[PDB]
Amino acid sequence: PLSVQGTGWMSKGQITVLDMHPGSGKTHRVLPELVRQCADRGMRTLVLAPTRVVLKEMERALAGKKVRFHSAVEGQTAIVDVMCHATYVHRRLLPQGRQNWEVAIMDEAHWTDPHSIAARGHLYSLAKENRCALVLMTATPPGRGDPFPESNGAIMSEERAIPDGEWREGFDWITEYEGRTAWFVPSISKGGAVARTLRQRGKSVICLNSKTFEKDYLRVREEKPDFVVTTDISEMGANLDVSRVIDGRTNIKPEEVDGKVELTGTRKVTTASAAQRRGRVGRTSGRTDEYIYSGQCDDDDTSLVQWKEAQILLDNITTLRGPVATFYGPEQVKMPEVAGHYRLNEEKRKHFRHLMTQCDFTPWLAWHVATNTSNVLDRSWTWQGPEENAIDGADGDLVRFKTPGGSERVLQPVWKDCRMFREGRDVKDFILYASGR
Ligand code: NI
C-alpha cells in the first residue's frame, strides 16, 4: 500500500487508514511487516488486535525481548506492545497502565464494540495532538460505505428469504448446498434456534458468539463444520473458510430507553457490517462464492447504547487536563454528551473497572453503579429499584436471594441492564454478586 511505503507513516501526527478490500492480507502480512519496521528502528509501538485469537496469531514469529505481549492485564516490566482493543482500555483505567506509544497500529478498526470505539477515539485524539502516529486497518472504515465492495474473487449476491430461527418446510437451498456456510444471526438466542434445525437435518454446526469465540473459533478449521452459526463477532478478522454466507442482515440492538437498557427486536445492520459479513467469502479468485442476504442496510445506529458506553470508557481512559478527547473523526457526531461527562475519580474508576473485569458488568451498568455507590461491598442497589425492574427467574417467578446476614431480598436493581440476564450472561451470575460472593 502506497501510504505506508517509506517512513512517512511513522511521523507523529500522521493518520493512515489502510482500507484495502478484504483478502488483501492486511492482518497476517502487512501488519507484521509494519511491526518489524517499527521494532528494528527502536520506536515505541502499540499494536491492537480485535480478539485474543488474533493476538496469538499476531504473536507467531514476533514475540521476544522486542515484542512484549499482554493477555485485560495489569503487569509492568519492551518497545513493541501487542494487546487487544479491550486490554488497551482496561489498562488505561489503571494509574499504572497509562503508558504512551509514538506509533499505534489498530487492526479491524471498524469494530463498534464500546472498547474499540474508545480505543480508536483516544488514539485519534493523540494523533491529532501530534503525540503519536496512528494506522487504522479495516476494509470498512468509519464513514460512507458500500455493502458490496470488491473481493479478490467473484461473489454471487442474491436476496432470498432467510428463516428467522427454526424452520419446518421449504428453504431447501440451505441444506442442498455442497460446501461450508457461514450463517450470521442477530443474537445468541436466534443462533441457537438456527443451530437446532441444522443439527436436526444432520449437519455439523459450530456456534460463534461473544462468549464462545475465543474457545470455539479455533475448532472451525480443525473440524470444518457444514455451518458456522455466528453473531457479528465474526466480522472482525475471522477466517471461517466458507464458500457461502447466509446473512439475515439483522443485529441485536441494545438501547437505553427510560433509563434502562432494553433488548427488544432487531435492527438492520449498517452497510459496514453487511460488507464485513459478505467479506467472509470471495477472499480469492478461484471459484465463485455466494452471499445470500435479506433486507436493506441501515447506517443510522446512533440510538445504540454502544456509543454512550464508548464515551463512558473514553472519558475514564483520558484526563481532564489537556485537549478534550473525541471519537474517531466521523464517529464524533454520535458521542451523546460533551466529552468528560462520564469521567470518574481514581477511587470510583477502580470500582468501575473491577465491576467489568471481575463481575462481567457492562460498561453502562458498571458506570451507573460506580458513580452512585460509595462502598464496594454494598449490594443494596440490586434490590432497591422500582417494581418495574423486578427480574424473573428461570421458572418465571421472582428471584429471591439471601444476603450473608440472613435477609431475603428480591432481585430489583436500581439500574436495569437487560444484557446481564441473557445473551451469554446468566441471571445466576448476577445473584452471586447480589448475595455477596
Ligand atoms: Ni483482516
Would you give the DSSP letter of residue 398?
Answer: B
Instruction: Measure 240 CA to ligand 1 centroid, in angstroms.
Output: 12
Q: Is 273 helix (H, G, I), strand (E, B) or coil?
A: helix
- Separation between Cα atoms, residue 125 and residue 131, nearest integer Å: 9
Close Cβ partners of 425 (under 8 Å, ≥ 6 residues apart) = 360, 419
Instruction: Measure 120 CA to ligand 1 centroid, in angstroms.
Output: 17
- Separation between Cα atoms, residue 332 and residue 121, nearest integer Å: 9
Residue of 295, 296, 306 lying closest to 255 (CA atoms) = 306
Distances (CA, A) of 239 to 54, 262, 281: 10, 32, 9
Instruction: Measure 105 CA to ligand 1 centroid, in angstroms.
Output: 13
Resolution in Å, one decimal place: 2.1
CB 114 within 8 A of CB 363: yes
Residue of 145, 110, 104 lying closest to 306 (CA atoms) = 110
Close Cβ partners of 144 (under 8 Å, ≥ 6 residues apart) = none
Torsion, CA 335, CA 336, CA 340, CA 344, rounded to 10: -120
Instruction: Measure 99 CA to ligand 1 centroid, in angstroms.
Output: 27
Residue showing cell 478534550? 324
Sign of the CA dihedral with 231 first, then 232, 235, and 236 last: negative
Helix axis angle, 346-357 relative to 85-92, nearest 10°? 150
Q: Which CATH superfamily is domain 155-293 in?
A: P-loop containing nucleotide triphosphate hydrolases (3.40.50.300)
Residue of 277, 251, 257 lying closest to 186 (CA atoms) = 251
- Separation between Cα atoms, residue 191 and residue 182, nearest integer Å: 12
Name the method of structure determination: X-ray
Helix axis angle, 85-92 relative to 114-128, nearest 10°? 70
H or E element in which residue 104 lies: strand 103-107
Instruction: Measure 65 CA to ligand 1 centroid, in angstroms.
Output: 26
- Separation between Cα atoms, residue 280 and residue 291, nearest integer Å: 9
Instruction: Measure 18 CA to ligand 1 centroid, in angstroms.
Output: 11
Instruction: Measure 89 CA to ligand 1 centroid, in angstroms.
Output: 21
Instruction: Measure 108 CA to ligand 1 centroid, in angstroms.
Output: 7
Ion ligand 1: residue ranges with CB closer than 5 A: 27, 237
Strands (E), 128-277: 133-137, 155-159, 181-184, 205-208, 227-230, 244-247, 250-252, 255-257, 260-262, 266-268
Angle ∠(208,212,216) on CA atoms, nearest 5: 75
- Separation between Cα atoms, residue 313 and residue 93, nearest integer Å: 8
Instruction: Return the CATH number of 2-137, one of 3.40.50.300, 2.60.40.1930, 3.90.1310.10, 3.50.50.60.
Output: 3.40.50.300
Close Cβ partners of 89 (under 8 Å, ≥ 6 residues apart) = 115, 118, 119, 313, 317
Same CATH topology for 2-137 and 155-293: the answer is yes
Q: Would residue 192 be called left, alpha or beta, if left means φ above 0 and alpha means ψ between -120 and 50 degrees? A: alpha
Instruction: Measure 106 CA to ligand 1 centroid, in angstroms.
Output: 11
- Separation between Cα atoms, residue 231 and residue 246, nearest integer Å: 12
Residues tagged in the binding site annotation for ATP: 20-27
**266-268 and 250-252 strand pairing:** antiparallel
In this structure, which amino acid lies at residue 368? H
Would you give the DSSP letter of residue 25?
Answer: -
Could you tell me how many helices (H) and strands (E) the chain has, helices first? 13, 18
Residues tagged in the binding site annotation: 20-27
Instruction: Measure 152 CA to ligand 1 centroid, in angstroms.
Output: 13
H or E element in which residue 48 lies: strand 45-49
Instruction: Measure 365 CA to ligand 1 centroid, in angstroms.
Output: 32
Torsion, CA 325, CA 233, CA 32, CA 12, rounded to 10: -10
Instruction: Measure 315 CA to ligand 1 centroid, in angstroms.
Output: 29
**Exposure of 403 by Cβ count < 10 A (0-12 exposed, 13-18 middle, 19+ buried)?**
middle
Strands (E), 190-243: 205-208, 227-230
Torsion, CA 140, CA 145, CA 148, CA 151, rounded to 10: -30
Close Cβ partners of 258 (under 8 Å, ≥ 6 residues apart) = none
Instruction: Measure 22 CA to ligand 1 centroid, in angstroms.
Output: 7
- Separation between Cα atoms, residue 162 and residue 250, nearest integer Å: 11
Q: Where are the alpha helices (DSSP H) in 98-158?
A: 114-128
Q: Is 228 helix (H, G, I), strand (E, B) or coil?
A: strand
- Dihedrals φ, ψ of 265, to 5°? 70, 180
Instruction: Measure 21 CA to ligand 1 centroid, in angstroms.
Output: 9
- Dihedrals φ, ψ of 434, to 5°? -65, -40
- Dihedrals φ, ψ of 271, to 5°? -65, -30
Instruction: Measure 364 CA to ligand 1 centroid, in angstroms.
Output: 29
- Dihedrals φ, ψ of 55, to 5°? -60, -50
Instruction: Measure 271 CA to ligand 1 centroid, in angstroms.
Output: 17
Quick one: cell of 310? 464508548
What count of other Cβ atoms lies within 10 Å of the Cβ of residue 367?
A: 25
In this structure, which amino acid lies at residue 220? V
